[PDB]
Amino acid sequence: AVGACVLCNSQTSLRCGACIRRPFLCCKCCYDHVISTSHKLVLSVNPYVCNAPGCDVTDVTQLYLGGMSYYCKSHKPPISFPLCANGQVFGLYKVTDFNAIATCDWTNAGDYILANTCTERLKLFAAETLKATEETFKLSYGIATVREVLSDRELHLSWEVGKPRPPLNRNYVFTGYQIGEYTFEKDAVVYRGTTTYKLNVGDYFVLTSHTVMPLSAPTLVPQEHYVRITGLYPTLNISDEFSSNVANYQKVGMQKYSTLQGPPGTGKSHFAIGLALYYPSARIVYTACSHAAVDALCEKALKYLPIDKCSRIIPARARVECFDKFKVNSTLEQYVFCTVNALPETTADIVVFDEISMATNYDLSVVNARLRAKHYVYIGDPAQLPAPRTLLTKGTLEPEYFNSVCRLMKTIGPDMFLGTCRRCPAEIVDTVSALVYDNKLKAHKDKSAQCFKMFYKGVITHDVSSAINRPQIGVVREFLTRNPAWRKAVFISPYNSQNAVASKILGLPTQTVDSSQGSEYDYVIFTQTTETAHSCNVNRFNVAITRAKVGILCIMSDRDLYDKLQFTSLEI
Ligand SMILES: [Zn+2]
Ligand SMILES: [Zn+2]
Ligand SMILES: [Zn+2]
């Protein structure tokens, strides 16, 4: 019970017993906390409570040191010192932002803003507090017990009365009782077990609430600039394919950490793997939050790096099928491909952290904690989608508050920018260039003349809160009869329930914008479904239309985003 103060580091015996993370606070900082918030319980070796029998005064502002023990006003002896005096709380070795972080419920955008604009030690406190609150909220939702099993991909669920019903999408992963992790999709519900188990009638599902480990490492190690490439040895014989990136690879080697903003299809993955080929002896750990982002780096490595120096690290509690062509769990291979949550304790010459828009400060810290590296490279795009904030319901989280890397990218700018989109027809590139990239994204491809927009509000129905627009799906169905080439299109919409209906009426493969990110398709059909904040979010809209290599059809509800699309308008 003798640690360091989360605000000024000063050693102390005092934690805050009201904070859910119980942070060590120094005498000066502990006072400024307890006098300004509803937080009054101060723990030490013993708690700061009235030592008098039966007395229930725990508020430190109402307590005194009577010799060696603690008493309230009613029980203190004549010779006693008030625990709160001259801006201090009595303890051994004798904050506005900290107070907002410590007391907020994380339902408001301003909470996240302050967790990303505060000091570095307060970013870790914020990250721990948020994640603990997120997990304790999971305990609040109602248990689902199996009433009857229809098929191998359908059952009917009995929901706990009194406790709310969680959103039934891919985002909410349940644990069966352990018969493995299970997900659900909309009385018939589609059940997807990570284990093919005969789901017995009477078995129940709960959202797995995990213990939040404390953070120690910063989100971002302190920046060091070097005059020469440090601890890395470049090739001279370097493949013409990666000639464009060489000046940026020499920037990576001349700084402790670097930021790469790579808009869609600009060569992020190419940049990541080309770093290995430019420093052929350097040990590189490839990390991202999702298995899909780590698999994508694996696929690009399989093509350019020797397969006997690559390992795919898989946690023994396997959640979804991931990359199978590398040696599994060989922690010591020159090239290690691992999700942030599964990272081992190791060192590296270079750490490459991919899809940085999806990373939380919690993740940024866990990386700096498990990996000690000569160089850290952060790759992604603050104009693409952040991790879902399940507690955030009031206000939108702007890109500059996604995490510490995105904040640097949006304030001082990224160290390196991939400026040329090679995936998308120019109609899409020009639209997103103006929308989110300040006219700095350039199109390699010509206009395809296969990018179309239709303004059609249709009719919005709701599967609980998830939205459906049957007319917008109807307009698409009529388009498909006249446009046979599009028969191979991926259907994209901001809503699972819109996609479930699109799948039955159209038979097209189906993707939410969020699940589409990092993917590409020749033809995309996008139905905006609604004019909500969710469906009008410029990041989500940017990701939606930059999935397409050849054609896109956008059935829009929002006049603003419709008018911004530099697409051929359709009638009907
Ligand atoms: Zn302090
Ligand atoms: Zn507190
Ligand atoms: Zn008392």
UniProtKB/Swiss-Prot annotation:
It comes from the Viruses. Residues 1-105 form the CV ZBD domain. Residues 237-418 form the (+)RNA virus helicase ATP-binding domain. Interacts with nsp8 to form the replication-transcription complex (RTC): nsp12, nsp7, two subunits of nsp8, and up to two subunits of nsp13. Interacts with host TBK1; this interaction inhibits TBK1 phosphorylation and decreases by 75% IRF3 phosphorylation, which leads to reduced IFN-beta production. LRR repeats lie at residues 208-228. The lineage of its organism: Viruses, Riboviria, Orthornavirae, Pisuviricota, Pisoniviricetes. This is Helicase nsp13. Zn(2+) 11 binds at residues 5, 8, 26, 29. Changing residue 240 to Y: In strain: Epsilon/B.1.427/B.1.429. Changing residue 348 to V: In strain: Theta/P.3.
